[PDB]
Design a protein around this motif. Sequence first.
Motif, PDB file in Angstrom:
ATOM      1  N   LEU A   1       0.898  -1.324   0.008  1.00 50.90           N
ATOM      2  CA  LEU A   1      -0.013  -0.094   0.005  1.00 50.90           C
ATOM      3  C   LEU A   1       0.823   1.191  -0.087  1.00 50.90           C
ATOM      4  O   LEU A   1       0.880   2.110  -1.176  1.00 50.90           O
ATOM      5  N   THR A   2       1.598   1.497   1.295  1.00 48.84           N
ATOM      6  CA  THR A   2       2.272   2.666   1.248  1.00 48.84           C
ATOM      7  C   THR A   2       3.707   2.586   1.168  1.00 48.84           C
ATOM      8  O   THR A   2       4.518   3.246   0.170  1.00 48.84           O
ATOM      9  N   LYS A   3       4.528   1.752   1.855  1.00 50.66           N
ATOM     10  CA  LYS A   3       5.799   1.226   2.108  1.00 50.66           C
ATOM     11  C   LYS A   3       6.747   2.485   2.416  1.00 50.66           C
ATOM     12  O   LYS A   3       8.175   2.259   2.561  1.00 50.66           O
ATOM     13  N   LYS A   4       6.386   3.743   2.288  1.00 54.15           N
ATOM     14  CA  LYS A   4       6.825   5.045   2.614  1.00 54.15           C
ATOM     15  C   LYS A   4       8.244   5.605   1.509  1.00 54.15           C
ATOM     16  O   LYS A   4       8.233   6.854   1.468  1.00 54.15           O
ATOM     17  N   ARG A   5       8.642   4.416   0.923  1.00 51.08           N
ATOM     18  CA  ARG A   5       9.592   4.471  -0.316  1.00 51.08           C
ATOM     19  C   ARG A   5      10.933   5.592  -0.222  1.00 51.08           C
ATOM     20  O   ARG A   5      11.769   5.227  -0.919  1.00 51.08           O
TER      21      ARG A   5
END
Lengths: 261, 207, 155
Positions: free
Chosen positions: B138-142
């Motif tokens: 979904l997000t993983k903050k990347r």
Amino acid sequence: MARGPKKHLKRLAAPKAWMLDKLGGVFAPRPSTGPHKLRESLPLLIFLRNRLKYALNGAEVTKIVMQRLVKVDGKVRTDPTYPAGYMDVITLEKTGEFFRLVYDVKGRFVIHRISAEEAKYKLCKVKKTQLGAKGVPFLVTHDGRTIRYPDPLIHANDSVQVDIASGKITDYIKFDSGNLCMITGGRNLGRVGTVVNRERHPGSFDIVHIKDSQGHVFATRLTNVFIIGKGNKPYISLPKGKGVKLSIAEERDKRLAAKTH
Amino acid sequence: GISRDSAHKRRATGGKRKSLRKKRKFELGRPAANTKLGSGRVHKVRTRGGNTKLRALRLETGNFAWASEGVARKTRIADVVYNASNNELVRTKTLVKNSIVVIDATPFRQWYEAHYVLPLGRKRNPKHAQKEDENDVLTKKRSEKVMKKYLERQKYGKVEQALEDQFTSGRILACISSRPGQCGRSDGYILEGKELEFYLKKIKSKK
Amino acid sequence: MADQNERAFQKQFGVNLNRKVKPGITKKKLLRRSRDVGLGFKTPREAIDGTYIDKKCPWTGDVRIRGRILTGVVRKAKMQRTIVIRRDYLHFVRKYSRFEKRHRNMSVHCSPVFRDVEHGDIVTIGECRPLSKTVRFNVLKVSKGQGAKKSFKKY
RNA sequence: CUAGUCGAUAGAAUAAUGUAGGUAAGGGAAGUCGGCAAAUUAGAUCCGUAACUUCGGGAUAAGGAUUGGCUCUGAAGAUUGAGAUAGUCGCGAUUAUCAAUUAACAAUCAAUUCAGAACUGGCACGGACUUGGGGAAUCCGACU
RNA sequence: GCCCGUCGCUACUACCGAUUGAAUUAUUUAGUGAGGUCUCCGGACGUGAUCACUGUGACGUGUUACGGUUGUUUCG
RNA sequence: GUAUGUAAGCGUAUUACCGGCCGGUACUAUUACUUUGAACAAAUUAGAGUGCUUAAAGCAGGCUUCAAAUGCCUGAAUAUUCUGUGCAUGGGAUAAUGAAAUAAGACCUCUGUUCUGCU
RNA sequence: AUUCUGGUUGAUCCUGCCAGUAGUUAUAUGCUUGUCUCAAAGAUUAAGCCAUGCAUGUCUAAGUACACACGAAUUAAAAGUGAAACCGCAAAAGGCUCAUUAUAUCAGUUAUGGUUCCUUAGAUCGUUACUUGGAUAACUGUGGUAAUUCUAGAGCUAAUACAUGCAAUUAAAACAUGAACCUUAUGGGACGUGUGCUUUUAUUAGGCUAAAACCAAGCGAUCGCAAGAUCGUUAUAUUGGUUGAACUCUAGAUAACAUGCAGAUCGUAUGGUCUUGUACCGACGACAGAUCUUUCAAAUGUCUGCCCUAUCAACUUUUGAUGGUAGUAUCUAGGACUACCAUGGUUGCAACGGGUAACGGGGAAUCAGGGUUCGAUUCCGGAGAGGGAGCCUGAGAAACGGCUACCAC
């Protein structure tokens, strides 16, 4: 395609601008789907046998085109019944023939020679300006020749000049009422210039009001015009005397003047 | 056979123009597809020469587009609920053109979580509380631009609540747009805005 | 006229509610691409903001008007989206160089933007694709439509 | 079912003829005074209807198709229409205008006759009962 | 002077006509079906893979290279 | 001297603008009718040319050339039945149709005391 | 030649005819009949039947040759001929017909923005056996059948036939997205992939008057130490078309979808290259295919214009009549046709009904015009191959010198 596709054409149904005979034979040449239309074309069997009169019969044509003498527009066109329509350059180098097709004052065709430089270029009309073919742009001419990527100011219904040995355009002229024009396939066909007026029909088929150099007005539909230059400024060598369409008595004046008696 | 011409059909004031050239080959039409929803079969046939038109029989699946983006995803057609005109095509469950068919709601969920990080629909928690593998993707903050790109994205997840009820149940309706009888496919798109809220009165109220 | 009364749903094909993601915001004040004939005929204003669907409408359907263009008078209008018009002309005989009153009758289709056309109104006509077994025309403009005596006046 | 009766001399026995209820491969009125006993037809829906008429018929003419069981959609109604809107008390409780609605709206209950369609069976279909053979003519007498 | 009409002779025309008449016509209501196209299905023989049969080439005898009136489960 | 059959001026949209009286451009109640036309196979009819020996033909052939032929061309036209309808244009007689009487007389328009905005 | 002539009646004039004489590519027949220039045609009744004959294939230097038939053999060249035999395309043209058909065919003007297409050409192919597989005619040989018109088993053998696909079939690049990055912005991805062509929808922009006030980035730049608020010019509210416009067209983009495709071909004539490496190269094609244009087209529409009857005055919805709408098929319009819906199209301006010794037409014959007759028949167009009906193959027949049925003979 249904039970056809009408692979013959007899006597008396070919267009009589071919100067076609009547007796003996019962058939027309019936050309084969070439770079021009049916009633507009003028093939090699019509010209060379009966009016150039260098081939006696049809079997005499079967040697010369198969011995590769006549080449039209740079290609040899070894089929004898190639249609060979208007504004095309018959490039016969022996014995320096160099013919083209210009319609007569009387609407027929004429044995007339051009130069070798006049054989290098030719003039050609266009019907539409197309976008979608390779890659994005395109341009379609009148004679089955194609132009990709042209100069973006030449729109449709114009006449451009190309070199046939190349694939480029050498000259173009505008669709203006100060230009030299040629009528192709109408009642008033075969007069040079000299248009001053056009009237856009609101749907459809606008006719153009073209006059001559002597003030005689005439007209036809838009499918007949061939713009052949500017104001008294042609781009070709011309045939005999300038499409003037004189009276029968004036036609009888040449019957008495240029004759010996 | 039967031709598709005017060999029948008395002219405009009643009288019978009788025969005039009995029959032609080209003027005919063939028996139609009558494609029941089945396990994906196809057949080849000559047409007007050169062209290869492809018809469908006993068909299974297809790819179907999305409304506000044009997102075409291939998935198994489940069943049908409604055809537009012939109820005697509804009951036998035959695949036609733009009929009301329920399809999947499955692949549009996973495809959209790049833009639609909030998963549509809301799956049940206490048996699917484990993620295989949802919450990381979904997000993983990347630590980078793409999560930051997804910050100004996911401003378009303001979709209609009715499909949000339908996505969490997992059976979305759609409208097969193309022709089954010209190309042999079942190609379409989800009805979303106004005919979606219309046809449920044609279905749920008549249920 | 319509509140979308149909056992299926009717919509002008080729448009979609695209809601948030868009090149700019092209609202266009309605999601209905109303074309125009551009043959000198002005468009009716009700056609642009119309709710009617009418796949066979010349303004708003998959139609482009072709053929010729003529005028005439209308008689019957009971049938749906379709009126019965009438044209007049003469004939030239050989025996007398005299004329006659014969006529033809072509049935034609209407968009509902020319709602309430009656007997004997005056209606111009233009050609299009075949619709269903007779209808190859479409109504262009309620041009005059005025009977100043018997038909076109209230009472 | 409800009420009531076994009351008609008996147990036995497969001869004729008779008494009544039947089917019989072919042809089908030859039979006989004579088509008389006897057979086909029979219900309902859908057409399709001839000559003569006093123009009310003849008319069910003739001449035909169709007809289960099982699984379904389409239709023919009744009562409350539904009932925005603003706040109150404490979501409970409490207070109101009416267009669109709304055509089998939204709740609710409802008779029974239709109008079609898939699939399937002695390949028999109104399955027994109820129940018509028909057609040109004559001569009567009009008729019930 | 022309000239009207039954009547009987004789010839000919055409019409009505009991005979539910007689052939023939181009359609056409429904009653069984030739033969095909489409199609549910069927699926001979003839295979390729393959468990597997065995030789030699190979591998560690089996497997395969090469093949068999090879048989068999496998799957098209 | 006279005539009037000629164009302009003058009892008036003899249209708005930029050009040198003179080009381009703003820009018009209809039909029926007629005008010049446009488009639109021949072939045939009519037929222009034309000494196939003549004709009916047919589109051939004609040609100091005489002693060489290089010997150019004329050609194969023109309209009617290629009637008609309909598709341009001229013209404004005839032939009807056509406004302004439950109310538009207009505003050339700075024009809204409307609102549809539209890029 | 805008032409009459005889007869009524004792004798007169009249309407009224009838008869005469004219031609007539309009067929027959009677008689005569020297030369010639030309020359209609078993249409008419009977679209009736048919012995035999024949009206259809075709090879270039170059698709495939293993032909003793041989040219040739110290050119094993086989390039000759290639008879064969697989192939390539054609066999739907013409020619024969007037029997069906009546606002239909057609005439004409007229659409295809409402479609397809064999082929000429015109642009038109850098997206792990590489120049592969297997299999058959001819050719032999065994035959069969009651049969001249058919045809089995076996041994063979090829492709510009079939099946399969690489050494550039190659990706760099361009390029979307995730991604070495990192930074505030008409800033930045190294790389993995994705990158052909069509099929398919969906989405997107589809043909664009002029100034700021103002504010979100705060862009060149301005106030400012700066952030960041102000304003502000240029390229930038940059896709085509008849240019009469959703031409949903080949274009441009996004998004995926299946199914193929993407010359393993060839000879003339060989070469530049000799490192002779058979590496690298000449024009070619009669060659094959895809993309588009073009040409000849064809098949439905569009208007106007057809022969005779009131002893046909109202017609069409059985099972489509006229429209709605979705959909099906169809190469595409579409009551073409299914279903659902409306209750309509049509007509005394001769509609629907029958009837014709009626294919239309370009056209043909007679005089002063206006014509009335016809025109089967060389031209054009529409149709049929006994009666009717389905249909293969192909681009193209509902084909008949293709097949199938039944029916007739």
